[PDB]
């Protein structure tokens, strides 16, 4: 899993908003700098900026 290093407020419908410290699963990461992620905290799924998260381990 990955962990959010910052909060992120959605800027389009298909973005995923998240809070610092939230755990995320990267569902797809082949479409560039924005990755499709699923929040293990909220259950929502959407695109995130890949530089706002880090590997958990």
């Amino acid at each position: 899993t990955f962990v959010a290093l910052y909060d992120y407020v959605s800027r389009t419908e298909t973005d995923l908003s998240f809070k610092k410290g939230e755990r995320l699963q990267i569902v797809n990461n082949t479409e560039g700098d924005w990755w499709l992620a699923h929040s293990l905290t909220t259950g929502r799924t959407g695109y995130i900026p890949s530089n706002y998260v880090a590997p958990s381990d």
Partner: peptide, 7 residues
């Protein structure tokens, strides 16, 4: 926060 990357 870091600059948001291009979409």
């Amino acid at each position: 926060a870091p600059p948001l990357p291009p979409r």
